[PDB]
Amino acid sequence: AVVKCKPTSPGRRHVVKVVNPELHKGKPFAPLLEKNSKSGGRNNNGRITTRHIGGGHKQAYRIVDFKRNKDGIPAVVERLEYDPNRSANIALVLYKDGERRYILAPKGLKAGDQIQSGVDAAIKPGNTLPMRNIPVGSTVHNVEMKPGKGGQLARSAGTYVQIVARDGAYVTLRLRSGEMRKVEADCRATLGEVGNAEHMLRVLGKAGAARWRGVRPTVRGTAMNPVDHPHGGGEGRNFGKHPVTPWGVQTKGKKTRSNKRTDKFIVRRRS
Amino acid sequence: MKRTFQPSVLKRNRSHGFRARMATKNGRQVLARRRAKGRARLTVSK
RNA sequence: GCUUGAGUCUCGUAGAGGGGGGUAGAAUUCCAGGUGUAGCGGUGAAAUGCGUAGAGAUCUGGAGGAAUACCGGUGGCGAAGGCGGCCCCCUGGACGAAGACUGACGCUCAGGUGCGAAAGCGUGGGGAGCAAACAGGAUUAGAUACCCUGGUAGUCCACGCC
RNA sequence: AGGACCGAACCGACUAAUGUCGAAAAAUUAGCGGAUGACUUGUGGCUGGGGGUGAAAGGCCAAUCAAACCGGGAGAUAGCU
RNA sequence: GCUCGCCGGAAGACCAAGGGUUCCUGUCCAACGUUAAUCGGGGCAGGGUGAGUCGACCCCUAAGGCGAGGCCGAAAGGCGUAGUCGAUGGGAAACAGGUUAAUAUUCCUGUACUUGGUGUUACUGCGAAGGGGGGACGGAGAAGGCUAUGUUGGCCGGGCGACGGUUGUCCCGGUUUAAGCGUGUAGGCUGGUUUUCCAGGCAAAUCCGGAAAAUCAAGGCUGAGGCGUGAUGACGAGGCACUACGGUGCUGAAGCAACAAAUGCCCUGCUUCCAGGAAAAGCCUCUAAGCAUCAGGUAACAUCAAAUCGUACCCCAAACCGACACAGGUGGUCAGGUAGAGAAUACCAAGGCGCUUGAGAGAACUCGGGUGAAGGAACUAGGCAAAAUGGUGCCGUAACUUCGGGAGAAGGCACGCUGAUAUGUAGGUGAGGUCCCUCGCGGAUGGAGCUGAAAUCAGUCGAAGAUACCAGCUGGCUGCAACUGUUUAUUAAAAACACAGCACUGUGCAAACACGAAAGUGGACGUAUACGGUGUGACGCCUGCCCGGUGCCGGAAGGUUAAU
RNA sequence: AAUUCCUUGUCGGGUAAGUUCCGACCUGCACGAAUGGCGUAAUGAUGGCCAGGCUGUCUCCACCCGAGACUCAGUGAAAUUGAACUCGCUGUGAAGAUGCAGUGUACCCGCGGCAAGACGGAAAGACCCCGUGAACCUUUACUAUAGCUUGACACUGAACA
RNA sequence: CUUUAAUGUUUGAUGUUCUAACGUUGACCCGUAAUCCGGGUUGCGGACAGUGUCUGGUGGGUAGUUUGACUGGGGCGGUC
RNA sequence: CGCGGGGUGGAGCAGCCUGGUAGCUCGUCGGGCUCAUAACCCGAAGGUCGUCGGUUCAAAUCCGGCCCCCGCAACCA
Numbered sequence A: 001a002v003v004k005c006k007p008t009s010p011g012r013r014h015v016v017k018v019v020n021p022e023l024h025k026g027k028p029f030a031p032l033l034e035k036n037s038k039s040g041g042r043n044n045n046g047r048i049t050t051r052h053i054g055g056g057h058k059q060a061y062r063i064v065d066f067k068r069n070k071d072g073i074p075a076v077v078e079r080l081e082y083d084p085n086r087s088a089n090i091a092l093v094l095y096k097d098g099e100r101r102y103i104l105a106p107k108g109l110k111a112g113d114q115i116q117s118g119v120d121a122a123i124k125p126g127n128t129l130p131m132r133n134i135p136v137g138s139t140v141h142n143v144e145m146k147p148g149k150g151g152q153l154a155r156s157a158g159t160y161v162q163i164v165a166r167d168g169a170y171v172t173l174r175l176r177s178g179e180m181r182k183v184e185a186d187c188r189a190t191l192g193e194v195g196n197a198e199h200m201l202r203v204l205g206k207a208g209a210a211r212w213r214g215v216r217p218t219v220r221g222t223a224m225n226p227v228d229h230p231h232g233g234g235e236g237r238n239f240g241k242h243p244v245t246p247w248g249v250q251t252k253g254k255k256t257r258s259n260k261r262t263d264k265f266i267v268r269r270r271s
Numbered sequence B: 001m002k003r004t005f006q007p008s009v010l011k012r013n014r015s016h017g018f019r020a021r022m023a024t025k026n027g028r029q030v031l032a033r034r035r036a037k038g039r040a041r042l043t044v045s046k
Numbered sequence C: 001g002c003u004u005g006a007g008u009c010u011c012g013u014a015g016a017g018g019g020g021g022g023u024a025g026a027a028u029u030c031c032a033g034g035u036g037u038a039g040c041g042g043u044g045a046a047a048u049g050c051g052u053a054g055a056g057a058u059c060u061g062g063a064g065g066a067a068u069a070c071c072g073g074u075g076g077c078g079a080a081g082g083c084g085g086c087c088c089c090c091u092g093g094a095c096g097a098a099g100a101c102u103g104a105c106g107c108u109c110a111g112g113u114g115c116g117a118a119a120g121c122g123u124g125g126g127g128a129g130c131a132a133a134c135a136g137g138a139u140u141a142g143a144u145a146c147c148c149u150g151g152u153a154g155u156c157c158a159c160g161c162c
Numbered sequence D: 001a002g003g004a005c006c007g008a009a010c011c012g013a014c015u016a017a018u019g020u021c022g023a024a025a026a027a028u029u030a031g032c033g034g035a036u037g038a039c040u041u042g043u044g045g046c047u048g049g050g051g052g053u054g055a056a057a058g059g060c061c062a063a064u065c066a067a068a069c070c071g072g073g074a075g076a077u078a079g080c081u
Numbered sequence E: 001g002c003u004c005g006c007c008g009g010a011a012g013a014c015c016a017a018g019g020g021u022u023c024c025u026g027u028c029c030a031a032c033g034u035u036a037a038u039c040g041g042g043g044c045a046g047g048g049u050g051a052g053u054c055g056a057c058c059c060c061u062a063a064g065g066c067g068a069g070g071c072c073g074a075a076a077g078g079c080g081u082a083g084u085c086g087a088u089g090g091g092a093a094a095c096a097g098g099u100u101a102a103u104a105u106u107c108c109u110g111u112a113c114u115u116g117g118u119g120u121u122a123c124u125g126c127g128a129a130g131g132g133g134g135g136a137c138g139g140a141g142a143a144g145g146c147u148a149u150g151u152u153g154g155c156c157g158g159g160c161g162a163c164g165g166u167u168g169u170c171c172c173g174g175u176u177u178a179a180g181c182g183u184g185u186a187g188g189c190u191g192g193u194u195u196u197c198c199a200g201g202c203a204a205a206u207c208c209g210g211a212a213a214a215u216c217a218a219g220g221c222u223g224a225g226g227c228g229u230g231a232u233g234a235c236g237a238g239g240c241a242c243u244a245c246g247g248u249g250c251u252g253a254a255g256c257a258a259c260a261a262a263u264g265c266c267c268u269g270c271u272u273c274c275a276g277g278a279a280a281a282g283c284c285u286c287u288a289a290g291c292a293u294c295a296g297g298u299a300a301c302a303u304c305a306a307a308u309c310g311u312a313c314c315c316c317a318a319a320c321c322g323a324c325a326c327a328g329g330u331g332g333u334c335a336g337g338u339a340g341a342g343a344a345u346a347c348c349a350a351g352g353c354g355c356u357u358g359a360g361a362g363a364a365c366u367c368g369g370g371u372g373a374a375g376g377a378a379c380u381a382g383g384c385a386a387a388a389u390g391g392u393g394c395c396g397u398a399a400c401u402u403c404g405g406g407a408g409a410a411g412g413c414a415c416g417c418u419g420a421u422a423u424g425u426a427g428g429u430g431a432g433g434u435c436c437c438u439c440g441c442g443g444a445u446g447g448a449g450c451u452g453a454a455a456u457c458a459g460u461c462g463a464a465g466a467u468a469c470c471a472g473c474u475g476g477c478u479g480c481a482a483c484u485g486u487u488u489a490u491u492a493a494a495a496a497c498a499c500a501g502c503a504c505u506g507u508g509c510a511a512a513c514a515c516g517a518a519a520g521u522g523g524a525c526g527u528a529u530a531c532g533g534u535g536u537g538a539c540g541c542c543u544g545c546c547c548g549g550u551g552c553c554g555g556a557a558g559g560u561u562a563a564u
Numbered sequence F: 001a002a003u004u005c006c007u008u009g010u011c012g013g014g015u016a017a018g019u020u021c022c023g024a025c026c027u028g029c030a031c032g033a034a035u036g037g038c039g040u041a042a043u044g045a046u047g048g049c050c051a052g053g054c055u056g057u058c059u060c061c062a063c064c065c066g067a068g069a070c071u072c073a074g075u076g077a078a079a080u081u082g083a084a085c086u087c088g089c090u091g092u093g094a095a096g097a098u099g100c101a102g103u104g105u106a107c108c109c110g111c112g113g114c115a116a117g118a119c120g121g122a123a124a125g126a127c128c129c130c131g132u133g134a135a136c137c138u139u140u141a142c143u144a145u146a147g148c149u150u151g152a153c154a155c156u157g158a159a160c161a
Numbered sequence G: 001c002u003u004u005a006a007u008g009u010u011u012g013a014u015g016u017u018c019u020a021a022c023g024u025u026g027a028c029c030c031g032u033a034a035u036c037c038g039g040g041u042u043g044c045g046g047a048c049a050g051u052g053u054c055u056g057g058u059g060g061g062u063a064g065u066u067u068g069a070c071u072g073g074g075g076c077g078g079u080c
Numbered sequence H: 001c002g003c004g005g006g007g008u009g010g011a012g013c014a015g016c017c018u019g020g021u022a023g024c025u026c027g028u029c030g031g032g033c034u035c036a037u038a039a040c041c042c043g044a045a046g047g048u049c050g051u052c053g054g055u056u057c058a059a060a061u062c063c064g065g066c067c068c069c070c071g072c073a074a075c076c077a
C-alpha cells in the first residue's frame, strides 16, 4: 500500500512508507538467526574496496533455505516476516513433520497456506519443482544455476523468470533484464513471482533515510580536485573531459562483458 | 582544544611493547639497534 | 377506501450490458539457420532509405504486442458516452405469459452526487504495427504542407485526475 | 510521528571588542547555531607515504602536508650569495 | 578565633583513566613559589595502602589480532581453518556503626550470604568438544504504583532572650536505621495437566518441536515497595567530667503520623512505529561412545579453603594532558531549601575557598560598564557596537501556499498585596467506623485530617506589580540555494559539498568494480524492484536542433598489418 | 542579471538629493534548456535595498564607578644593538643626510606624554624577473609502462563431416 | 602456359561429437567436532577457459623530463 | 608590427589543387501562355579572369610587387 505520510515537517513531505499489515508483530524465530557485522566495504587488507558503504543499523541474519532439499514433505506457511536483508519479505514455514524454516514469499501467499517441495507437487504459487515437470510457459523464481548451489535468480521483490522452453537438456530462460540464458533442466525452480511488489514504489523522502540504511554519501567527480578524481578542478566546474570511472576506465558506453567461460550459456544478451 | 598525548598505558604497551616489537621482522632489528647503541630503556614500560 | 398510476413475486426470452481470469487463429515485425541473387522498396516521376558485409523473395522453428476477416444487418443492448473471436465466474437493466398481492407508495427537480469517447497528465510495466513533433528526400516562386522513407510521446494494462 | 519549534548540560564556532613579546604557539568576554538527531561521546580496534582518509578543502595523517616524520645514499648538486 | 564576601548541577563530594608517594607527622629556609615566609605539593627523616563478598586476575565471547597443517608468494612475507587471545560486554556472594595524625563495602563489634573439596547418612542411575530452553538485548512515548528525599505538625530537650513587643497560633535543634530472611501485593506474561505416535533437531532422546485425543478451568513463572524480623541493638541533641588546653571517657529523651514527589526502581515492562534491533559461557535438562558390589547426582549436616595484584593521595585540577603552580581541555555517579516549568537563573545549606605580590594616588589615555539635555542613523564601506523588545493566560492575525504552514505573524488586555465567595474552592490523597468474605498486603462504603490551582467581587499601596536575575526586535521587496545538515582545526561556514528524487550506462553471479605481484577478501552469505560508475540536484511546468570533430558501441566484405 | 564591455544604459517608483535597490524596455561585447531553463510556500548565524522602534553611532560629547597606567617597597625580562660628545635648515651627494659644506639656533641631566624621522624592529620580499633549480597538475608535448585486449607457440587429445 | 579433374601425399582454417588433460566459489563422504584445504565417488563443462612466452593496438591510470634566446621589466609582436 | 585564405558577367559562386576545353541559378532585353502582374518555359548578348612584368608551344592556371577585406592585437602590477 502506497501510504504517504502527511507533510508535517520539511523532509517528511515526500515520504512514501509502503508499510505492511500482514507481518508478525513481534521478534522472529530465534533458532534461525546468526549475527551479521557489516565490514563497511573493506577487504582483509583493510582498504576501502567499495565506496559509499559505512555506518548503518545493526542487522541479524536469518538463514534462509533456497535449496528445498526435502522431497514429499508437506509444509505450512504460518506467518510472514520482514527481512532486514532482502527486499523480499521471507515467510516462516512449518513443515508438517516438526521443523520450521524461512523461504522467500510468492505473490498472493498468506498465513496458514499449504505447500510442498518436490517433483510430486502440482501447480500453485510457492510450490518448488525440478523444472522439467513445470508448464512450459510459466513464471518462476529463485532458480538455481548449479543444481545444488541453493538459489540464484530473481530473489528480490516483484521479480520473476519466464521459462521459454526445454529444448534437449537445457532450459531456455528469460530474465527480467532480457538476457535469455540456457541452463540445464537439473535445477530447481520455485513457481510464481516474488511478493511485496510495491517495494519499488517506496521512496525514502529524507537524506537521513539512505544513511541509516547504510549508504554513505557519493562525492561527485566534477567536485573532486584533479588529484583525487580524473575529472575535477577548473574555476567554475570546468568539466570537459570524457566521463570515466574514478580509475580511468571509460563509462557511459563500455562493454566489460569479459567472461568467455560462460558465453556458451548466454543466448541473447541484453536487448 | 585537546592536547595530543592522551595517557593510556594499554596503547602505550599494545604497539610499543616488548612482545609487540619482538613479534614481527622489523621489530626485532629495532630492538637489536637499541641494544646496539647500549640504551638502558629499550621500549619504556612499567 | 377502490382501481385503470406505480411497484413486486412465481416461469420463461433475446442480447457487442459491465467487470474480472484464461485461451485461440491469421497477419505484421524481429532473431537464428538452410536455398539463392542483383536488385528491393516507392511514386505521377524520382530520390532518400535498403543491398555483393549478401537484402527482397522462400521454407522451418521460436519469442512477441495489439486488434478480432467472414457471420454483420438504416441489426441488437444500454441513460448517454459507448460496446462485437470463443470459454468460465460474479452481476445489471429491458420484455413476454396467466394470476395474485400492497393500495396513489407518484411526475420533475435549482443545490447536490455519480457516470462520462478521444486527447492530455502522475506512478509502475508493456512496446508488434501504427504514428504528433522531428529528420532526410521530393513538389514548389518559398514548403517548417499534401507524397514517400525512417521515427520518439502516445496508442495497450492495473490504480487515480482531468 | 517528527533530520519539529523555544531552550540548559553537551557539541560546534557567525559578529565585535580585548589579546597579538597574551592567561593561552587561535583563548576569554557579551550575544549566537544545533540539541531525539545525517546527534554527541568514553573505552578499544582496522586503513600508512606516491599510500591512507575525505557530506571533497588539494583539507586531515601527533602544533609539521600539492605528497608526514626518522635514519641511510650524502660532505647530494648550486654557471648562485 | 570573631566578622565580611564567593561558588553552591560547584570553585562541593566520590571513582575510571593516567601520574607515582605529590597523602600524614616532625624539622629546616639558601636553592623551587614570579613578593616575604617559623608556610607549603621544596629539601632531609620516619610512618601509612590490611579483603572469600570491591575492581582485576579468572570462566566465556564480539570488532579485530596471532595462528600448527593449508593455498600462495623472488626471499622477507601475506591471508586464513581448527584453536587461541582480546572489554567498553555477559557470569557467584555484604550492609550498618565505631576508630586513626594518614586507611577501611578490607580493621573491630554485631548481624548475613556464595561457589567448590574431603568426609557421614539415607535414596537414586549417571555420563560429552553433541542437541534444546534460557541467557538475549531497538528507538521514541504515555500511564499506574512506590522509594530516595523535603516540609509541616505532633512529641522530647533548651530558651522566653543585651533597643520596643515575645509563656504564646512564639523560636531554635533532633526526629536517623541497611544487607539478609519471611510474607510474597500493586503489575505484567502465559491456558495448565494427562495419554499416544513421529520421514524432525549430522546419531540417540523421556528435552524441544508437531498432529490428534482428554479433563478442568486455573496452575505456574516473575515482581520495586510496604509490612514483621533484623533491633529490650546501634546511633542520637543536650548534659555529666579532665585539659598535653588538640580532644577523650561516660550517660543518654523523642525516634511517628501526613502530604508532596524524581530522569531512580517495578521496567533486561506496556502501546506504537519502522531504519527491524550481538555472540559464547555460567545455569536447567536429554541422551551418545559407555560404566553400574562401583563411579557420580540429589538432600540434610560437620569441617576446611577462598589464593595473587591493586587498595595511600590527586581524580572537570598547582599532582592528568598543555615546557610553567597556565583564564584551555577531561568520561561516569550522588546532587538539598525558596521563587521558578526547569539540571536556567538569583540567593543560601552540607562542604570548600578569598584566585601566592601589596600599600598609597585617582593625571592623560586604554579597557569593562552606569547615566544623559534636544534631535534620532545626519555615523559609516554597511545600523558593526550598544540600545530596545523579552514572561503566562486570553483576544485577534494578512500576501502567499506544496493546504503542513505563514504564526509566538503584527498589534493588544489583565498581572502586586489583603479579605470575602469558602474559619483556603474545584481537584488530589485518604485513617477510623460499618458490611461482606473464595480471610489476605482484600473489596465497596465512609469521610476526619493534610496539601493546594484558579476565576469573580471589594479595598488599598506605589511613578512602576513578568517590578530583579532570567527573558524574541518586527515588517515589506528580492537574488541564490530546496530544506536539517557538512566544510578550509590555527584569517574564508557561503551561493561551496551533501541531499531525497531523477537519467544514462555497466553487471547473469567465480557479476561488473576494487585492494592485492598471488592466494584470499570486500561487493554479499546481496543477486536486475539488486549492486557499481557518471551527471544534475526537492516539488511544479518543460527539457528544443546538430552524429561534421572526439569518445563509445555494432557490422565487419575489402586495403594495410606483428610474431610464426 | 552572481552574466551587459561600452555605462552612473533607458522610463517609472522610493528619497529634497538614489553610481546601490525594485519593476519593466531588448541595442544579449559574451543567458540558455541535467556543465539544466523558468517560477517556488517553507527554511536561512546568507548577499542587497527600505520603513518603524530604539538607542551616544553621530551633530559634540560630558560626568561617574572600577581594573591598569603614576608613586613607594620586594622580584625582575624582552625583541634590538658597529661605534657615538646623537639640533633644524639650504645645497650637494649611490640621486629625500644627526654626521660634508654654509648657516642659524642651543645651559648639563631626568620623568610623565604623544608617535613626524632614524628609508625604525620582526619575516635571507610571498609581488616581477633571472636560474639551461625543484615540485606537483593537464593534454591530440616526447618516450616507456600497469592493466585491459588480439593472435601465435606451449600445458593440449582422438575421430569423422 | 592456362583452364580443370580423379588420386596419392603434405599442412592449415571451420562444423560436430567423444573423454582422459584441465576447470569445477555443483552435491556428498572421510580425514575432523573444523564455512580453509587435500583426496575419493558422482554430476556439469571441455581440449575451451585460464597461465607462462613472443607480439600488434590502446593507454596521463602511472612514471622520468623537456618546454630556446635577445628583449631599453616581463609578456604579446618581431628577429635569429 | 604578423600569419592564413580570397579578389572571377548586374548579385554570388564553378573551374585553380594536378597547365592546351570558361559553367550554373537569379538578374537584363524580349517573346510566349493569362483579360493583368507575378511565376514559369525558352533563346541570345553579357567574363581586360583586379593590374603589370616574367616563363614555356599556350597564362584564368606557376611566380613576384601594390591595393581592398575578415579573425586575433589595443597588456599586466
Ligand SMILES: *C(=O)[C@H](CCSC)NC=O
Residues within 6 Å of the ligand: F127, H077
Ligand atoms: C601588485 O601590486 C602586487 C600584487 C600582489 S598579489 C599577492 N602587490 C605587491 O607586490
